[PDB]
Design an enzyme around this catalytic site. Structure first.
Site, PDB file in Angstrom:
ATOM      1  N   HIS A 156       0.823  -1.206   0.000  1.00 11.57           N
ATOM      2  CA  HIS A 156       0.000   0.000   0.000  1.00 11.57           C
ATOM      3  C   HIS A 156       0.860   1.261   0.000  1.00 11.57           C
ATOM      4  CE1 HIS A 156      -3.218  -2.734   2.064  1.00 11.57           C
ATOM      5  NE2 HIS A 156      -3.053  -3.031   0.786  1.00 11.57           N
ATOM      6  N   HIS A 202      -9.301  -1.754  -4.913  1.00 10.91           N
ATOM      7  CA  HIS A 202      -8.199  -2.112  -4.036  1.00 10.91           C
ATOM      8  C   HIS A 202      -7.252  -3.108  -4.693  1.00 10.91           C
ATOM      9  CE1 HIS A 202      -5.876  -2.275  -0.371  1.00 10.91           C
ATOM     10  NE2 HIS A 202      -5.752  -3.568  -0.615  1.00 10.91           N
ATOM     11  N   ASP A 216      -3.321  -2.613  -5.092  1.00 14.86           N
ATOM     12  CA  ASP A 216      -2.353  -3.645  -4.728  1.00 14.86           C
ATOM     13  C   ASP A 216      -1.407  -3.929  -5.901  1.00 14.86           C
ATOM     14  OD1 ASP A 216      -2.945  -4.073  -2.033  1.00 14.86           O
ATOM     15  OD2 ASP A 216      -4.303  -5.705  -2.299  1.00 14.86           O
ATOM     16  N   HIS A 236      -0.651 -11.091  -4.795  1.00 17.08           N
ATOM     17  CA  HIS A 236       0.752 -10.695  -4.686  1.00 17.08           C
ATOM     18  C   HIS A 236       1.731 -11.731  -5.219  1.00 17.08           C
ATOM     19  CE1 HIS A 236      -0.785  -7.415  -2.345  1.00 17.08           C
ATOM     20  NE2 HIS A 236      -1.248  -8.233  -1.417  1.00 17.08           N
TER      21      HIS A 236
HETATM   22  N1  LIG Z   1     -14.696  -6.833  15.195  1.00 19.11           N
HETATM   23  C1  LIG Z   1     -13.687  -7.005  14.197  1.00 19.11           C
HETATM   24  C2  LIG Z   1     -12.345  -7.169  14.562  1.00 19.11           C
HETATM   25  C3  LIG Z   1     -11.357  -7.351  13.584  1.00 19.11           C
HETATM   26  C4  LIG Z   1     -11.739  -7.352  12.241  1.00 19.11           C
HETATM   27  C5  LIG Z   1     -10.782  -7.554  11.129  1.00 19.11           C
HETATM   28  C6  LIG Z   1     -10.023  -7.736  10.212  1.00 19.11           C
HETATM   29  C7  LIG Z   1      -9.122  -7.983   9.062  1.00 19.11           C
HETATM   30  C8  LIG Z   1      -8.426  -8.196   8.106  1.00 19.11           C
HETATM   31  C9  LIG Z   1      -7.600  -8.466   6.909  1.00 19.11           C
HETATM   32  C10 LIG Z   1      -6.618  -9.465   6.868  1.00 19.11           C
HETATM   33  C11 LIG Z   1      -5.910  -9.681   5.677  1.00 19.11           C
HETATM   34  C12 LIG Z   1      -6.211  -8.907   4.545  1.00 19.11           C
HETATM   35  C13 LIG Z   1      -5.549  -9.133   3.233  1.00 19.11           C
HETATM   36  O1  LIG Z   1      -5.062 -10.224   2.978  1.00 19.11           O
HETATM   37  N2  LIG Z   1      -5.983  -8.300   2.171  1.00 19.11           N
HETATM   38  C14 LIG Z   1      -5.405  -8.309   0.898  1.00 19.11           C
HETATM   39  C15 LIG Z   1      -6.322  -8.538  -0.217  1.00 19.11           C
HETATM   40  C16 LIG Z   1      -7.223  -9.714  -0.044  1.00 19.11           C
HETATM   41  C17 LIG Z   1      -6.929 -11.015  -0.365  1.00 19.11           C
HETATM   42  N3  LIG Z   1      -8.005 -11.769  -0.102  1.00 19.11           N
HETATM   43  C18 LIG Z   1      -8.975 -10.949   0.379  1.00 19.11           C
HETATM   44  N4  LIG Z   1      -8.481  -9.683   0.402  1.00 19.11           N
HETATM   45  C19 LIG Z   1      -4.550  -7.149   0.656  1.00 19.11           C
HETATM   46  O2  LIG Z   1      -5.061  -6.043   0.602  1.00 19.11           O
HETATM   47  N5  LIG Z   1      -3.143  -7.271   0.458  1.00 19.11           N
HETATM   48  O3  LIG Z   1      -2.479  -6.193   0.117  1.00 19.11           O
HETATM   49  C20 LIG Z   1      -7.205  -7.932   4.596  1.00 19.11           C
HETATM   50  C21 LIG Z   1      -7.910  -7.717   5.778  1.00 19.11           C
HETATM   51  C22 LIG Z   1     -13.082  -7.201  11.878  1.00 19.11           C
HETATM   52  C23 LIG Z   1     -14.063  -7.022  12.853  1.00 19.11           C
HETATM   53 ZN   LIG Z   2      -3.951  -4.539  -0.341  1.00 17.52          ZN
END
Ligand SMILES: Nc1ccc(C#CC#Cc2ccc(C(=O)N[C@@H](Cc3cnc[nH]3)C(=O)NO)cc2)cc1
Ligand SMILES: [Zn+2]
Ligand SMILES: [Zn+2]
Ligand SMILES: [Zn+2]
EC number: 3.5.1.108
Length: 298
Positions: A78, A237, A241, A264
């Site tokens: 990011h 998004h 990325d 990625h």
């Molecule tokens: N009450 C409560 C408490 C905590 C939470 C929470 C949370 C969270 C999270 C999270 C973990 C991993 C990722 C991630 O892999 N995202 C990817 C892109 C991606 C890959 N697969 C899906 N996305 C990405 O953007 N990479 O750059 C993103 C987010 C929620 C509610």
């Molecule tokens: Zn991302």
């Protein structure tokens, strides 16, 4: 000529690591011509530097991680996306821990920091990598492609079948001739599926994650109270990325990236695959900025 650029001033922010939950100090600093982006772990003794280049990418499962021996800098995508979008060639990035702070989950806070630091033009020609031949990589149904293009364009399609995604566009093609990275891409937040986040948390992972830094969806709805920042925030998004991962080439791109359910891992495979074939790309500069298909006017 189109000149290289760096920051005018040093600037700082703090946050928490998405994966680690660890509080981290971030510093962005100016750097000399031809430095590129270099990350430094200032908490270590001695301090460890890792250039932001494709060849230094280790694991890519959750985020893009830079590695040097046993030392890592996690979640660089990011921040690097913001550097790419604002055309920053040279900068030092200092970190007090092994992960860039997640901030609000988008590239916005980094665009904010870079713009606030100020942009400094430097006395050297900015180098661009121009795609000459189409190069592709795939894994199963996932595909990532570089295509020749007289400009800079990023296209992406995702293909989720969950009810929450039904009817959503799940596709975007951004030509930066007429699209603002800052206004229309940078603020797209990362997203996660509830089931997947639960699994991570059960292993004491994703500790920094919250609805304040990620869009969380279950099978059926977006959990965030305020909805989305962009109508097509999810695919935006993925584009964000890709732009961050692509900047590990070390130079701005003249060409198009096309992603299909890619992440990625495929992004980095595509970079290494492109770099290895000298017939598929070339380095160019522009002595006359108005002859360029790209512009980093500010
Ligand atoms: N009450 C409560 C408490 C905590 C939470 C929470 C949370 C969270 C999270 C999270 C973990 C991993 C990722 C991630 O892999 N995202 C990817 C892109 C991606 C890959 N697969 C899906 N996305 C990405 O953007 N990479 O750059 C993103 C987010 C929620 C509610
Ligand atoms: Zn991302
Ligand atoms: Zn489902
Ligand atoms: Zn490879």
């Amino acid at each position: 000529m189109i000149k290289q650029r760096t920051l005018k001033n040093i600037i700082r922010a703090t946050g928490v690591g998405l994966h680690s939950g660890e509080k981290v100090y971030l510093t962005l600093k100016p750097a000399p011509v031809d430095t590129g982006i270099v990350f430094s772990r200032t908490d270590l003794d001695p301090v460890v530097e890792i250039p932001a280049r494709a060849e230094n990418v280790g694991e890519t499962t959750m985020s893009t991680t830079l590695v040097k021996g046993d030392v890592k800098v996690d979640t660089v995508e990011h921040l690097l996306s913001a550097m790419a979008g604002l055309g920053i060639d040279n900068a030092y990035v200092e970190l007090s821990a092994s992960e860039v702070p997640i901030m609000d989950g988008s590239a916005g806070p980094f665009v904010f920091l870079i713009q606030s630091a100020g942009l400094q033009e430097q006395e050297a020609a900015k180098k661009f990598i121009r795609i000459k031949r189409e190069v592709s990589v795939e894994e199963g149904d996932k595909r990532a492609v570089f295509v020749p293009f007289d400009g800079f364009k990023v296209s992406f399609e995702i293909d989720f079948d969950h009810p929450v995604f039904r009817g959503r566009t799940q596709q975007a093609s951004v030509d930066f001739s007429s699209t603002s990275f800052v206004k229309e891409v940078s603020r797209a937040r990362t997203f996660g599926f509830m089931r997947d986040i639960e699994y991570l948390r059960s292993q004491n992972l994703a500790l920094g994650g919250s609805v304040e830094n990620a869009i969380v969806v279950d099978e059926n709805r977006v959990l965030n109270e305020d909805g989305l920042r962009y109508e097509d925030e999810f695919v935006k998004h993925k584009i964000l990325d890709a732009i961050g991962d692509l900047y590990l080439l070390g130079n701005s791109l003249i060409g198009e990236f096309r992603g299909f359910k890619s992440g990625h891992a495929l992004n980095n495979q595509l970079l290494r695959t492109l770099i290895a074939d000298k017939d598929a790309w070339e380095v160019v500069t522009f002595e006359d900025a108005r002859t360029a298909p790209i512009s980093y006017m500010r």
